[PDB]
Design a protein around this ligand. Structure first.
Ligand SMILES: C[C@@]1(Cc2cn([C@H]3C[C@H](O)[C@@H](CO)O3)c(=O)[nH]c2=O)CN([C@H]2C[C@H](O)[C@@H](CO)O2)C(=O)NC1=O
Ligand SMILES: C[Se@@+](CC[C@H](N)C(=O)O)C[C@H]1O[C@@H](n2cnc3c(N)ncnc32)[C@H](O)[C@@H]1O
Ligand code: SF4
Length: 338
């Protein structure tokens, strides 16, 4: 059930680090097909004759490498920065924004000393103000972590700092190895949730809603700060009742738990102009409605723009989500709607 790659690439430089050495001996012991990248770290020869084939096989391929870009991206509204522990995902969410943000093997970085050292510099440059880090900005870091334990190390590193905070969101239940981690109350452990329609139709290759909630109870019992990310908020047929049933069912599955300091994050479905065509050839018979005529185009600033719902329909979603959260989780804090 936990993700295990069917193909692994190693950057030569990765073998100079403890994690690279450990992963090399791990995957060779497991008899998994292991390859070397070029001297300039390019991944060549991923199986597949069509574009869709190489996309599928890429999502079953792991690349063990070194993070050379030590400048951290900003990650608002979640956190000040994105801490780069991994890139890519094993899941096949039809709407996924990684389809345009990438183009899709799973990359993991081994130079944790360097990455954490850089994280500490960002913390020092803003202290005594709090600096939050998003570890799942460009990947499902939790779904990958049983292989590496990099997130666990990041959790404990952040736990040792005074002004640092960590956060990440996942669609996977494979969190057992993280339960005895010394988080020190400085990690927000979030789970992506959605209506039954969106999960059943658009989220294959992820854990079930029940699995995610089972995992959510485990992490909360281990003392982690708990939160949920309701995204993508998607106006499907019967969305108002669909999302009502979500929060009702969510409240039922978290019965008899300390839900003080529970957070919610709300993201409406969004897609870029290229995504329409890219998704059409990566998921041909998807029910995902990418009709531009029912959307508002929000023009980009430094990046490319994207379609979102019109201001009025967006407010319907926001007001509705806020109403259900207040009904089923009194005192819970909605961090943002975007
Ligand atoms: C898990 C995320 C992390 C995140 C990612 N990203 C990056 C990931 C990728 O490079 C890009 C996707 O448009 O945006 C970002 O800018 N801000 C974030 O807060 C995901 N998102 C993203 C996706 C959305 O387009 C953007 C704007 O809120 O933020 C978010 O709102 N909440 C989060 O907590
Ligand atoms: C890219 Se996701 C990375 C973390 C992890 N693999 C996870 O799925 O939780 C970050 C969040 O953003 C949502 N999301 C993904 N695509 C979109 C989208 N196109 N529109 C609107 N939201 C989109 C996902 O449901 C997640 O809640
Ligand atoms: S689990 Fe997250 S990162 Fe992975 S395909 Fe789904 S939305 Fe994308």
């Amino acid at each position: 059930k936990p993700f295990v790659p069917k193909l692994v690439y190693f950057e030569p430089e990765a073998l100079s680090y403890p994690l690279g050495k450990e992963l090399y001996e791990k995957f060779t012991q497991m008899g998994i097909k292991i390859r070397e990248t070029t001297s300039h770290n390019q991944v060549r020869g991923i199986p597949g004759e069509t574009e869709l084939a190489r996309y599928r096989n890429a999502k079953s391929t792991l690349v063990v490498g070194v993070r050379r870009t030590l400048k951290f991206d900003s990650s608002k509204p979640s956190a000040e920065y994105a801490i780069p522990l991994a890139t890519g995902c094993m899941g096949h969410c039809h709407y996924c924004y990684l389809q345009t943000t990438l183009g899709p093997y799973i990359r993991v970085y081994v130079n944790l000393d360097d990455i954490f050292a850089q994280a500490q510099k960002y913390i020092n440059e803003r202290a005594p103000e709090i600096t939050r880090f998003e570890a799942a900005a460009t990947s499902d870091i939790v779904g990958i972590d049983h292989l590496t334990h990099s997130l666990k190390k990041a959790i404990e590193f952040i736990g040792a700092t005074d002004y640092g905070r960590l956060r990440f969101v996942t669609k996977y239940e494979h969190v057992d190895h993280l339960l005895d981690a010394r988080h020190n109350g400085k990690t927000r452990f979030r789970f992506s949730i959605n209506s039954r329609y969106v999960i059943n139709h658009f989220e294959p290759g992820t854990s079930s809603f029940d699995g995610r909630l089972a995992a959510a109870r485990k992490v909360a019992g281990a003392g982690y700060k708990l939160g949920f990310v309701v995204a993508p908020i998607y106006r499907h047929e019967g969305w108002e009742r669909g999302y009502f049933e979500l929060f009702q069912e969510l409240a039922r599955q978290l019965e008899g738990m300390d839900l003080s300091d529970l957070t919610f994050e709300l993201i409406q479905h969004r897609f870029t102009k290229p995504a329409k065509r890219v998704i059409e050839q990566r998921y041909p018979k998807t029910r995902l409605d990418l009709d531009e005529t029912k959307r508002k185009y929000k023009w980009g600033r430094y990046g490319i723009g994207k379609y979102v719902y019109r201001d009025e329909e967006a407010k319907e979603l926001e007001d509705t989500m806020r109403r259900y959260i207040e009904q089923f989780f009194p005192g819970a804090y909605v961090q943002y709607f975007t």
